[PDB]
Design an enzyme around this catalytic site. Structure first.
Site, PDB file in Angstrom:
ATOM      1  N   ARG A 255     -10.492   2.935  10.817  1.00  0.00           N
ATOM      2  CA  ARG A 255      -9.692   2.001  10.032  1.00  0.00           C
ATOM      3  C   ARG A 255      -8.271   1.909  10.574  1.00  0.00           C
ATOM      4  NH1 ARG A 255      -8.240   2.677   3.563  1.00  0.00           N
ATOM      5  NH2 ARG A 255      -7.007   0.754   3.354  1.00  0.00           N
ATOM      6  N   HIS A 356       9.077   2.791  -1.248  1.00  0.00           N
ATOM      7  CA  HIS A 356       7.888   2.040  -1.649  1.00  0.00           C
ATOM      8  C   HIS A 356       7.622   2.181  -3.146  1.00  0.00           C
ATOM      9  CE1 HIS A 356       3.778   0.383  -1.149  1.00  0.00           C
ATOM     10  NE2 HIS A 356       3.430   1.318  -2.013  1.00  0.00           N
ATOM     11  N   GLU A 357       7.683   3.413  -3.656  1.00  0.00           N
ATOM     12  CA  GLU A 357       7.416   3.642  -5.072  1.00  0.00           C
ATOM     13  C   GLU A 357       8.493   3.016  -5.950  1.00  0.00           C
ATOM     14  OE1 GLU A 357       4.624   4.820  -6.136  1.00  0.00           O
ATOM     15  OE2 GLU A 357       3.898   5.246  -4.110  1.00  0.00           O
ATOM     16  N   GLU A 384       1.664  -4.034  -3.418  1.00  0.00           N
ATOM     17  CA  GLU A 384       1.744  -3.280  -2.174  1.00  0.00           C
ATOM     18  C   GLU A 384       2.618  -3.988  -1.149  1.00  0.00           C
ATOM     19  OE1 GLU A 384       0.301  -0.423  -2.435  1.00  0.00           O
ATOM     20  OE2 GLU A 384       0.717   0.407  -0.447  1.00  0.00           O
ATOM     21  N   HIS A 487     -13.887   3.106  -0.191  1.00  0.00           N
ATOM     22  CA  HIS A 487     -13.744   1.873  -0.958  1.00  0.00           C
ATOM     23  C   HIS A 487     -15.077   1.167  -1.164  1.00  0.00           C
ATOM     24  CE1 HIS A 487      -9.688   2.743   0.453  1.00  0.00           C
ATOM     25  NE2 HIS A 487      -9.227   1.942  -0.490  1.00  0.00           N
TER      26      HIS A 487
END
Ligand SMILES: *[C@@H]1O[C@H](CO)[C@@H](O[C@@H]2O[C@H](CO)[C@@H](O[C@@H]3O[C@H](CO)[C@@H](O)[C@H](O)[C@@H]3O)[C@H](O)[C@H]2NC(C)=O)[C@H](O)[C@H]1NC(C)=O
Ligand SMILES: *[C@@H]1O[C@H](CO)[C@@H](O[C@@H]2O[C@H](CO)[C@@H](O)[C@H](O)[C@H]2NC(C)=O)[C@H](O)[C@H]1NC(C)=O
Ligand SMILES: *[C@@H]1O[C@H](CO)[C@@H](O[C@@H]2O[C@H](CO)[C@@H](O)[C@H](O)[C@H]2NC(C)=O)[C@H](O)[C@H]1NC(C)=O
Ligand SMILES: *[C@@H]1O[C@H](CO)[C@@H](O[C@@H]2O[C@H](CO)[C@@H](O)[C@H](O)[C@H]2NC(C)=O)[C@H](O)[C@H]1NC(C)=O
Ligand SMILES: *[C@@H]1O[C@H](CO)[C@@H](O[C@@H]2O[C@H](CO)[C@@H](O)[C@H](O)[C@H]2NC(C)=O)[C@H](O)[C@H]1NC(C)=O
Ligand SMILES: *[C@@H]1O[C@H](CO)[C@@H](O[C@@H]2O[C@H](CO)[C@@H](O)[C@H](O)[C@H]2NC(C)=O)[C@H](O)[C@H]1NC(C)=O
Ligand SMILES: *[C@@H]1O[C@H](CO)[C@@H](O[C@@H]2O[C@H](CO)[C@@H](O)[C@H](O)[C@H]2NC(C)=O)[C@H](O)[C@H]1NC(C)=O
Ligand SMILES: *[C@@H]1O[C@H](CO)[C@@H](O[C@@H]2O[C@H](CO)[C@@H](O)[C@H](O)[C@H]2NC(C)=O)[C@H](O)[C@H]1NC(C)=O
Ligand SMILES: *[C@@H]1O[C@H](CO)[C@@H](O)[C@H](O)[C@H]1NC(C)=O
Ligand SMILES: *[C@@H]1O[C@H](CO)[C@@H](O)[C@H](O)[C@H]1NC(C)=O
Ligand SMILES: *[C@@H]1O[C@H](CO)[C@@H](O)[C@H](O)[C@H]1NC(C)=O
Ligand SMILES: *[C@@H]1O[C@H](CO)[C@@H](O)[C@H](O)[C@H]1NC(C)=O
Ligand SMILES: *[C@@H]1O[C@H](CO)[C@@H](O)[C@H](O)[C@H]1NC(C)=O
Ligand SMILES: *[C@@H]1O[C@H](CO)[C@@H](O)[C@H](O)[C@H]1NC(C)=O
Ligand SMILES: *[C@@H]1O[C@H](CO)[C@@H](O)[C@H](O)[C@H]1NC(C)=O
EC number: 3.4.17.23
Lengths: 595, 273, 277
Positions: A255, A356-357, A384, A487
């Protein structure tokens, strides 16, 4: 007296009750995640069961309101989001069977062990052993053994489970007035009732295919460069014409190509930008990191952090006596309470993760001014993207030297720029063909275009044609290789990553053009740009009340996702790869195989 | 011809209005059952309310906060209740919403001050403080200064509700969720409303009349109750009756006046020219 | 809660020619050795004053007259008592629950001054009980108002205990009152003069001093006097009968706008007065 007024009254009652109930459930979940014990888990389970029963009752009550008689878009969207009776249209036995299949697949993926053929007394687990072998090991035989063991010990067990799962999901989707489960998943991008901002379900597939066709040259050049670099580490295992092997991609499934940076580094004589030492010599702390992040966000033009965020969040590890999950997550309690759960260490990576958070928290606070059912992102990839644009704007050398971590005398060399662009490419564009191929395979297996006796056959055909990945050994119909991912074995959508990858670069280009910044796009900083802050807040405020196309037009100026900003982000890297691939054969041929 | 000093005398400020009873009350009422305490026959010192940083909002409509102690009224109504933080601005003339339409509405010509302060330290408890309620549904908007303690099931549809909840049959009163971890906006805010009413009745509630120090053997203008004269105040040898405030000579001119604080008689002589 | 009163034979109302009494202080101005002329609501030196009797004969007229009297511009209330029979007054317009009224009453412990729209009764009175067990009276049965609502003014005094025993002899107490309602203020004047008479209060001069000034914007049209009743074991009656009224009598004189020449002495007290009529 009309149906719309009754719907508004029911929506008000729901927004009153569900708010407090979800707040209690989130408090229980926070107490469990920050404090693992036998009582917090029971409290969280009780709160979750109560919330689920309440949602089921409210959905069964709201199903008595017709959707064709409502003329208000907000009320219609709230009713449509509330009337989602997904796991209740099937029979009780079928629903129980589907839940059992989901649970057993989750347990097989989680509790999946593999023992060495020569050391049966010590077996290997996925997270500690298999990821380490696929990431930090260079032996061809060891990586091949690990890949084959993971595809055989767990892949073969999930074949009939997945064969029944696809049928049950197709039945559930057809019961919900859908064509297949892929259509049910694509329905998240569907918007109707607005002139000019409509978006169908097949148009998503068309746009994804067009963006992939436009991005294919950059990925082909990157694949050629990675192949030329890997031919040195593996002289007689990889061919200059064929595709790359599956177990030599630095990942268990291929990935992310991030672990291939140590082998495909353009200029190894200049180290990457690492301010960890400069952060530890200046006596920094997690409190200082979050204060600097808040300073960045308030300089952009966004409000400060709430006092509860500072007096209730756990920004550091509590210690050894109290156990907590050290996974960075942004918590939206619902009643004006916003917290961040992160075991922040003094590291640049933790700095970007905190940015990011905090971007997630800013999005939450922005859309908190809307009803409960609309307090969510406009699409499954907007949150995101809003986090990653901040993570990218905070990692620029200009921002680092303006904060104080990077020295002001540090010069910007093009070799470090090429190395940073190559790392960003391996971590961003490397997963785009993989995501596209996986999602297309799932769509074609849900629609019914692939017979059950050709699943892995067409899977490897696509992974060799679309992606530059060829399987080492032939896998027949019993090696369910696709189901070896988290996923896909846990019922999670995957196109969200492709969509958010496009959206982050679109937002970055838009905010950089609004910031009056010249030069390359990857060196853009929007710290002191209030215009870009307002232009982004105009999109973060809409939340889920407005269609995602209108939000896009508000933030970037176009109602459809475009890949041109992504190509503009990697333009110098594109030129460098074209310059470095003069003698190498760009592209790949599907006739080659390591057999 | 040069009155230098300016003295202002008035009786002692006694019988203060019970503001500490409505402001420091232990248990407040909900917004739908707000109490209406009547304030009259007392001196209201509004300086202690304005000069206190504990109150977040001190907006006054139709009157100035500084000139509150310089005005008289007939009676003051104190409407005290607990409201959510994000709906405090709904308590204002000309505002809409759920509280300003179904629980408590102010008239467009409202003359008074709205006072509110955060009470998360008292009205919030771990687990949820569900003691305060608010009216969520009603058939029509409320009139200015109107209470509604009805508990009838709100019939939202054509189907008659048989006094029980169900489809299109909702309970009108809903309880607030006050947790100590709630952010600003969802925290409980104790808000009191001081409504000023002026009628044909004599003014009973006034502001505290300030008093200045006395001075003797100097030409100074004075003001005890309503006497605005100018002269020299000296100690006298006469004795007034226990009720007579001031006196006058045979020539119908102010001669003496009793001090409203010391109950002493002071002679008044016009400053010679 | 209210109980009517029977066995009260009606008698023609008597009238007594008042003397120079009724003069009060019209203002708070100090004057010494001067004759000042005032034009305010005063009482003439000689006018018809209605005489109300409250006695209890030994057999072959029991009178407990406390009717609702009008209030034109001001009343002069004079009390000739021996055992504190008069407890207070009930001022108002209609004495109903639709309009506000003034309630002034002394219940032997506090001076109650309430301005509310009460629901009064035809015969409002207080009662005492000659309890021979503890040789004490301890008055009870406060029957004045039944429904009290929407109070705008309230005032109570410090606790005390006045003499409630029934004295025998002559009237050894004289309480004069002058009530005025102008500009929304209810002015009350009072004067206590120890006398010794049986009836037809003697001629004299007593300047009534201002007692209180109650700001109440209410219309005063009629007023009723609050008397008291005695009850003991030697009283035949259960609910309406079985009571006796102590020897007492009050006088009511209406004020009229006239000119008076007030004579002040060296201490600021009115000594004499002259009426111009
Ligand atoms: C208004 O308040 C002032 C201040 O309280 C009063 O002034 C003072 O009042 C007292 C009491 O009447 C006078 O007597 C003094 O009492 C204290 C305490 O018992 C005693 O220690 C002293 O020796 C003296 O006897 C006092 O003289 C008077 N002035 C001062 C400077 O203290 C004033 O009387 C009040 N006026 C009214 C109308 O209430
Ligand atoms: C759908 O209903 C909402 C009410 O929930 C409408 O929102 C109102 O919009 C007007 C004008 O923009 C505001 O003045 C009101 O305050 C809003 N009501 C709120 C926020 O509760 C909305 O306009 C309706 N949709 C349409 C298309 O009319
Ligand atoms: C954004 O604006 C802030 C405030 O003007 C800048 O911070 C100042 O930067 C200069 C340049 O080095 C320093 O001399 C000042 O001391 C800084 N201010 C403070 C309070 O420390 C900042 O450099 C600007 N740019 C960015 C990217 O933040
Ligand atoms: C409610 O109680 C508080 C607490 O005592 C009062 O605040 C005081 O106000 C006086 C006024 O000068 C100050 O001297 C005190 O220092 C205050 N207390 C504290 C703890 O700071 C407040 O005044 C009361 N409310 C009313 C209307 O009187
Ligand atoms: C006392 O007697 C009166 C008349 O004989 C009774 O009738 C009341 O009369 C007054 C004034 O005339 C009215 O305001 C009341 O409404 C009358 N009451 C009723 C019930 O009609 C009166 O009822 C008697 N009191 C008692 C306690 O019986
Ligand atoms: C009260 O004024 C009247 C005015 O003349 C007088 O008393 C009246 O006397 C006649 C003669 O019998 C009677 O018919 C009237 O009924 C009486 N009227 C009143 C109101 O009593 C007298 O001047 C005054 N009364 C007294 C006792 O002096
Ligand atoms: C006389 O009247 C006063 C006022 O109406 C009474 O005082 C009140 O009495 C009630 C009942 O006992 C109490 O609940 C209040 O607290 C009292 N208030 C005050 C200020 O004292 C008084 O008790 C009455 N006395 C008699 C003998 O009836
Ligand atoms: C005298 O003593 C008696 C004995 O109890 C008391 O009067 C009674 O007290 C009881 C107790 O509450 C009640 O029945 C009444 O309050 C009184 N009834 C009667 C008929 O008087 C009280 O202690 C004293 N009473 C008096 C009037 O002095
Ligand atoms: C974590 O939970 C345990 C079990 O109830 C409790 O004893 C402990 O105090 C909790 N820790 C904190 C920080 O609250
Ligand atoms: C599920 O919802 C759809 C429409 O949202 C409705 O047609 C269907 O009847 C529902 N299922 C059941 C079992 O009622
Ligand atoms: C954020 O906080 C800083 C100081 O703490 C302040 O100067 C700034 O105005 C605040 N911004 C807001 C409240 O939007
Ligand atoms: C980097 O810049 C130097 C100096 O301008 C130049 O010689 C070199 O070729 C550049 N390298 C790349 C990869 O652009
Ligand atoms: C009390 O009486 C006054 C008299 O004007 C009136 O204004 C007020 O509304 C009344 N209050 C009630 C009936 O609650
Ligand atoms: C008193 O009477 C006047 C005129 O007679 C009237 O205007 C006023 O409204 C009355 N007040 C009350 C309280 O009845
Ligand atoms: C007036 O006052 C003096 C003392 O000031 C006193 O001796 C005299 O008796 C008083 N006279 C009257 C009539 O009160």
């Amino acid at each position: 007296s009309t149906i719309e007024e009754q719907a508004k009254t029911f929506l008000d009652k729901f927004n009153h009750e569900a708010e407090d109930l979800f707040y209690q459930s989130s408090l229980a979940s926070w107490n469990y995640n920050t404090n693992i014990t036998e009582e917090n888990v029971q409290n969280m389970n009780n709160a979750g069961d109560k919330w689920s029963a309440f949602l089921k009752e409210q959905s069964t009550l709201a199903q008595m309101y017709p959707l064709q008689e409502i003329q208000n878009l907000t009320v219609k969207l709230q009713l449509q989001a509330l009337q989602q009776n997904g796991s209740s249209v099937l029979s009780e036995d079928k629903s129980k069977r589907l839940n059992t299949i989901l649970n057993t697949m989750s347990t097989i993926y989680s509790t999946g062990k593999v023992c060495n053929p020569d050391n049966p007394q010590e077996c290997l687990l996925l997270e500690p052993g298999l990821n380490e072998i696929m990431a930090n090991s260079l032996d061809y035989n060891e990586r091949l053994w690990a890949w084959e063991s993971w595809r055989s010990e767990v892949g073969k067990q999930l074949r009939p489970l997945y064969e029944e799962y696809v049928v049950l999901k197709n039945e559930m989707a057809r019961a919900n007035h859908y064509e297949d489960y892929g259509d049910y998943w694509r329905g998240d991008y569907e918007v109707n009732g607005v002139d000019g901002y409509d978006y169908s379900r097949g148009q998503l597939i068309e746009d994804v295919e067009h963006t992939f066709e436009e991005i294919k040259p950059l990925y082909e050049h990157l694949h050629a460069y990675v192949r030329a670099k890997l031919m040195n580490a593996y002289p007689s295992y990889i061919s200059p014409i064929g595709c790359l092997p599956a177990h030599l991609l630095g990942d268990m499934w291929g990935r992310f190509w991030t672990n291939l940076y140590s082998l495909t580094v353009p200029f190894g004589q200049k180290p990457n930008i690492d301010v960890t030492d400069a952060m530890v010599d200046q006596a920094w702390d997690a409190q200082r990191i979050f204060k600097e992040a808040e300073k960045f966000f308030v300089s952009v033009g966004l409000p400060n952090m709430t006092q509860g965020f500072w007096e209730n969040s756990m920004l550091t590890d509590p210690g050894n006596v109290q156990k907590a999950v050290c996974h960075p997550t942004a918590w939206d309690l619902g009643k004006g309470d916003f917290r961040i759960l992160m075991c922040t260490k003094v590291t640049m990576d933790d700095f970007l993760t905190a940015h990011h958070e905090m971007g997630h928290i800013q999005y939450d606070m922005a859309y908190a001014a809307q009803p409960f059912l609309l307090r969510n992102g406009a699409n499954e990839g907007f949150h995101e993207a809003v986090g990653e644009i901040m993570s990218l704007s905070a990692a620029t050398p200009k921002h680092l030297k303006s904060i104080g971590l990077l020295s002001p005398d540090f010069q910007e060399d093009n070799e470090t720029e090429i190395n940073f662009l190559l790392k960003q490419a391996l971590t961003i564009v490397g997963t785009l063909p993989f995501t596209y191929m996986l999602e297309k395979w799932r769509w074609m297996v849900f629609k019914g275009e692939i017979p059950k006796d050709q699943w892995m056959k067409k899977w490897w055909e696509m992974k060799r044609e679309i992606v530059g990945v060829v399987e080492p050994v032939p896998h027949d119909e019993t090696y369910c290789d696709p189901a070896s991912l988290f996923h896909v074995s846990n019922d999670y959508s995957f196109i969200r990553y492709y969509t958010r990858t496009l959206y982050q670069f679109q937002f970055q280009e838009a905010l950089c053009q609004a910031a009056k910044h010249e030069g390359p796009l990857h060196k853009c900083d929007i710290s002191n740009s209030t215009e870009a802050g307002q232009k982004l807040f105009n999109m973060l405020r809409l939340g889920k009340s407005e269609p995602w196309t209108l939000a896009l037009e508000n933030v970037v100026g176009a109602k459809n996702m475009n890949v041109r900003p992504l190509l503009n982000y990697f333009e110098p890297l594109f030129t460098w790869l074209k310059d470095q691939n003069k003698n190498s054969f760009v592209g790949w041929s599907t006739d080659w195989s390591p057999y | 011809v040069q009155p230098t000093e300016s003295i202002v005398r008035f009786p002692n400020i006694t019988n203060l209005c019970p503001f500490g009873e409505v402001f420091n009350a232990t248990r407040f009422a909900s917004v739908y059952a707000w109490n209406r305490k009547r304030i009259s026959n007392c001196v209201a010192d509004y300086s202690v309310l304005y000069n206190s940083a504990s109150f977040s909002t001190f907006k006054c409509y139709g009157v100035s906060p500084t000139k509150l102690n310089d005005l008289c009224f007939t009676n003051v109504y104190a409407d005290s209740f607990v409201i959510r933080g994000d709906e405090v601005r709904q308590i204002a003339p000309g505002q809409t919403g759920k509280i300003a339409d179904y629980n408590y509405k102010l008239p467009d010509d409202f003359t008074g001050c709205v006072i509110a302060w955060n009470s998360n330290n008292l009205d919030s408890k771990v687990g949820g403080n569900y003691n305060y309620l608010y009216r969520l549904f009603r058939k029509s908007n409320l009139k200015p200064f109107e209470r509604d303690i009805s508990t009838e099931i709100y019939q939202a549809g054509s189907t008659p509700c048989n006094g029980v909840e169900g489809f299109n049959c909702y309970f009108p009163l809903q309880s607030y969720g006050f947790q100590p971890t709630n952010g600003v906006g969802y925290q409980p805010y104790r808000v009191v409303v001081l409504s000023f009413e002026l009628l044909h009745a004599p003014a009973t509630v006034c502001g505290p009349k300030k008093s200045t120090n006395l001075v003797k053997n100097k030409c100074v203008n004075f003001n005890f109750n309503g006497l605005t004269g100018t002269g020299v105040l000296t100690e006298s040898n006469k004795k007034f009756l226990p009720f007579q405030q001031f006196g006058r000579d045979i020539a119908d001119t102010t001669d003496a006046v009793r001090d409203p604080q010391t109950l002493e008689i002071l002679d008044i002589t016009p400053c010679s020219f």
